[PDB]
Design a binder for these strands. Structure first.
Lengths: 156, 144, 129, 36
RNA sequence: GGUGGGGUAACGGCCCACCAAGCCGAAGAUCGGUACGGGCCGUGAGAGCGGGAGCCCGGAGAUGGACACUGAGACACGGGUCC
RNA sequence: ACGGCUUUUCCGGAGUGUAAAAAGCUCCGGGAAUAAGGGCUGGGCAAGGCCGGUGGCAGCCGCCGCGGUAAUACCGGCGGCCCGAGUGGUGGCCACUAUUAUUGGGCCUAAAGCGGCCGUAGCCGGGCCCGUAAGUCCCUGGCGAAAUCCCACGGCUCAACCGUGGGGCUCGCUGGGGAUACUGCGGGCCUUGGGACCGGGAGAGGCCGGGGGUACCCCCGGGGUAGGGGUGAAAUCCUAUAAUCCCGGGGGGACCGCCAGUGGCGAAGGCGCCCGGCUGGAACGGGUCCGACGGUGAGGGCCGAAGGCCAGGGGAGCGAACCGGAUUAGAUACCCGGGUAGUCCUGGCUGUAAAGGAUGCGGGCUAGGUGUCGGGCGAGCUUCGAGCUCGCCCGGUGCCGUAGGGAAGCCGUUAAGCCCGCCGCCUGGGGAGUACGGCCGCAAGGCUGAAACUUAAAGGAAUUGGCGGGGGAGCACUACAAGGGGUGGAGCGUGCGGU
RNA sequence: GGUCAGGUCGAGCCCGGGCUCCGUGAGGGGGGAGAAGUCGUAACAAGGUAGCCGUAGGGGAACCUACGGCUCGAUC
RNA sequence: UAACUUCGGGAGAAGGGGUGCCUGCGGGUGCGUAACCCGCAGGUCGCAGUGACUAGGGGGGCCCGACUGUUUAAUAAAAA
């Protein structure tokens, strides 16, 4: 079920079982890498880059292509971005959660009586703390990193 | 409304703690561990006791029965506490006099309390003046 | 959330057998489940089974012969020595050598009778009868 | 106050709400007599 | 806890002088209740529950405390000093 | 009853035994001679419907229960039953007791799910590959005194008791070698659980601001006379200072009628006039992004109906307290006329409800049928509408119902069914949510929470009947409705109560 | 071994302060048992004003009222 | 360092130990061994070291008035 609402929505993606890219893919690995870097320069997130590639360029997914520089792993948008030195400084989902938490706090400062929005903010902050703990364990950010409502504005 | 917990391989501490916590809801175990009976027992945890008769009284039979049950008030030599002792026998009362030494013994009611239609009385006379009340009632022996 | 796929599989097998289903599907697939199914087939409690790839952990298709009275995982996975099998047999089976206690040992998973024959112990991971 | 739902049943007893009011009055009176 | 010493048959905050703030604790410190510990005994199909005076091993005490002499061995039940 | 036999035991004696004795042992003389009691007798529980005594008195009774002039239940007589050199009474421990539940208990209605959520430690944790052997298993050295425990043999006559061998017990500790399925640990690779993101939509989800709906109340100006209101009936009350009522105007404070639905949104509490702004969450459709980041959570935190409290505003209608009118034997109430706090707004405290789906939360599985809400897909109509009809998938929300569950009522893919996790709570009814102690709060109160003593039941589901100042059918001159004649008032006949 | 001084262990006695337990103290508070008392009738049927929970105020006693809530509510 | 409490108090509650002189060290602020304070070690004298002077005695109950304050100049300062 959902993390907080405890509902059982099942909408999602159902990809076919595949191990190699489909033949009808027009572009090659290098061309799709260039397209990914071009979209990142345009200023899209990883998810939006993948969606654009799937919709406009007819690329079902970059994960189907084997990584030329590492036979032991498949390609990935984040891996391509870090190869070209454009990966996020901090995780994108955490960034989005922090951004909307800051916006919610700004709204609550003007509307102190919005207790339901306050509860939503509390849930958002719990999710942020969960992500911070996970990334601390995996070493994706400094061990002393802590989420501060005051300091989060600078990150935003 | 769920699988009784904990059931993990490494939950022995929590399982033992839960058992210890919930064993206190048992009245018998709580009484035994805290020695509650010995704290308030007039006989101080003894099978029988000795005392001196202070007066002879009679108690009404509990409903729906009817009748007068003859008993005595006995002062224990152990601590001087005064208790009521039932006098079993058809005519046991006539064999007991004031300021006589009597050995009282628990009454075999539920748990350790009163029995039958005489609530409140927890003890019964056995020997009076070092002679058995049953023998006195049956008439083979004589009161000294 | 999902905790023990093996327990899920065994419970599903028992549930579907009680209503007489001829075929069952076990999801997700794991090598422990595969070995347990292999042991059950060897002892004749199930029919043919196969592994299906689906881009995920995988699936198992299993045929039921209407022979299982009850099958279930054992948890916690109690460790057991060679000389400490009678108590577990009495606990989990109706009669001596009636069912099979699936045990994971240092030499793979096998029936408790096979473990006794080989003179080794292990951990009790399931039971069937 | 902690709850005994079975106390609300009226079979051979007074209404629990009035019992509660009486008990609260008695508690206050006991406090007054003790001086607290 | 350390640096240096005294004393001990011997290591030791056992004690002393000098340096620091360390050490224990909700996985229950401290405090309070009860109790000599064990081999074992009672009971139950077993899991377990309860007891742990008599026999053996170990520990303490000699009316309640505190001290010392002789001796390998005591601060000594039928040796000594004081309250 | 008659005729026989033996001397374990009894009495006396000789040896042997003992340090000396005694006890035991061999033998001799006498002789069935010296040797059975305790509880119980209605059931549970084997044993009497026998006889005398007491008549709710004596008494008996672990529990049920017996005794009230007919006692197999009390006392005794005679019988009978259970054990028997023992048999009964009292206290304690274990089993009984799956009433302490790891094996192995329960929490809708009987005791029991925190009022609801987020999260710290702990516990439990998706798939594949490789490495270590911590856990785990196997083998092998050093141990865990003896007695005690079990087995075979041998010695006291067998036995208890001892001796010789084998095993177990001391719940385990420790030196090495092997294994790698599982768990722990380190590395690598994934997407199924869970998060992030985009697209078109749904909803009384929340806050702020601005414009309205009638209705109710008051005030003024006209019309108009004597009533209005209210009840079962009345009265209090308003009304001549012009009431009720109709009309033209002004002012105020609550609430948003029908549509409205087993309807929709929220963790819960709760949330309905209409536009604009801000804001939270969820469902659906995604060959989109990260890659186990998850579940539950002792402590702790946040919200939380009504009511109440602090301070400042407001106060139309309702209305605790109170004051009057009625009813009643009484009415401190139900009924009627007024009425303060409150109900409302701003900033805080209180943290309590039948806060009830009386049902904790996440995951997998187990026949179907039929409504409705949202989304998507296909088909047919269409006035081409964001329109209508049918079918399918996902997620909510109701009903019936099969396997199965339950004491039953009933639940039954929205389980109260079988499994895998985590916490909370319960251990007969009262005493008692009381006493004491501590913490919190301005107070009221909140949280935590016993003992002495008392009791055999309390409690749940359902069945038959008897009842209801419940419903529906019927019937009756010892019921009525329509009627005839009377009794009840006087004297007397007769029968009762009383004297 | 006497006397004196110093340094230690240090009983006993006295004072103050914590902790635990034990015995009473006129009187007050409720609790439980009792018998065949006084006042009324609160609940069980629509129990005669449906019952019940939370808060608040009243009343000799059972309950009376107000606000919010449930059916563990009979009739239509 | 107690009962109680209006949580501010009660409070210097109560109760216990030390206190002179001399020979030196160390610390604070300070340019300073200037000036004022704060500690440490040793020796030593008396009955007595805040040696004179200065300089609270304390605790537990009850009635009245809440508190500070005012009053009969010249018998009443109090609960008025």
């Amino acid at each position: 079920a959902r993390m907080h609402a405890r509902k059982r929505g099942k909408s999602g993606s159902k990809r076919p079982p595949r191990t190699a890219p489909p033949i009808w893919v027009e572009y090659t690995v290098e061309e799709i890498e260039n397209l990914v870097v071009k979209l990142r320069k345009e200023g899209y997130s990883t998810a939006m880059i993948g969606t654009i590639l799937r919709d406009q360029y007819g690329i079902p997914s970059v994960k189907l292509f084997k990584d030329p520089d590492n036979p032991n792993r498949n390609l990935t948008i984040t891996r391509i971005l870090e190869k070209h030195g454009l990966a996020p400084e901090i995780p994108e989902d955490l960034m989005f959660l922090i951004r909307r938490a800051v916006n919610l706090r700004k709204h609550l400062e003007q509307h102190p009586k919005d207790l339901h929005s306050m509860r939503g903010l509390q849930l958002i902050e719990s999710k942020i703390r969960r992500l911070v703990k996970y990334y601390k364990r995996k070493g994706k950010l400094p061990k002393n990193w802590r989420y501060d409502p005051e300091t989060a504005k600078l990150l935003v | 409304p769920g699988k009784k917990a904990p059931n993990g391989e490494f939950a022995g501490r929590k399982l033992k703690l839960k058992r210890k916590k919930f064993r206190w809801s048992d009245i018998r175990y709580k009484r035994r561990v805290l020695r509650l009976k010995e704290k308030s027992d007039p006989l101080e945890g003894a099978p029988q006791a000795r005392g001196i008769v202070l007066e002879k009284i009679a108690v009404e039979a509990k409903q729906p029965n009817s009748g007068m049950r003859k008993a005595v008030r006995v002062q224990l030599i152990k601590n001087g506490k005064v208790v009521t002792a039932f006098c079993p026998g058809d005519g046991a009362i006539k064999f007991i006099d004031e300021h006589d030494e009597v050995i009282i013994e628990g009454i075999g009611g539920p748990k350790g309390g009163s029995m039958g239609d005489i609530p409140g009385i927890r003890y019964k006379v056995v020997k009076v003046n070092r002679v058995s009340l049953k023998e006195l009632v049956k008439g083979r022996k004589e009161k000294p | 959330t999902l905790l023990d796929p093996l327990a899920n599989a065994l419970s599903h097998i028992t549930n579907s057998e009680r209503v007489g289903k001829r075929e069952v599907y076990i999801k997700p697939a794991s090598k422990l489940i595969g070995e347990v199914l292999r042991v059950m087939q060897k002892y004749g409690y199930i029919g043919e089974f196969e592994f299906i790839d689906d881009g995920r952990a995988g699936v198992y298709r299993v045929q039921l012969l209407g022979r299982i009275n009850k099958a279930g995982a054992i948890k916690p996975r109690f460790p057991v020595k060679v000389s400490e099998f009678e108590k577990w047999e009495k606990r989990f089976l109706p009669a001596f050598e009636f069912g099979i206690l699936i045990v994971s040992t240092s030499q793979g998973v096998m029936s408790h009778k096979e473990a006794i024959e080989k003179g080794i112990g292990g951990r009790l991971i399931a039971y069937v009868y | 106050m902690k709850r005994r739902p079975r106390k609300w049943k009226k079979k051979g007893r007074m209404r629990w709400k009035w019992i509660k009011k009486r008990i609260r009055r008695l508690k206050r009176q006991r406090k007054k007599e003790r001086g607290l």
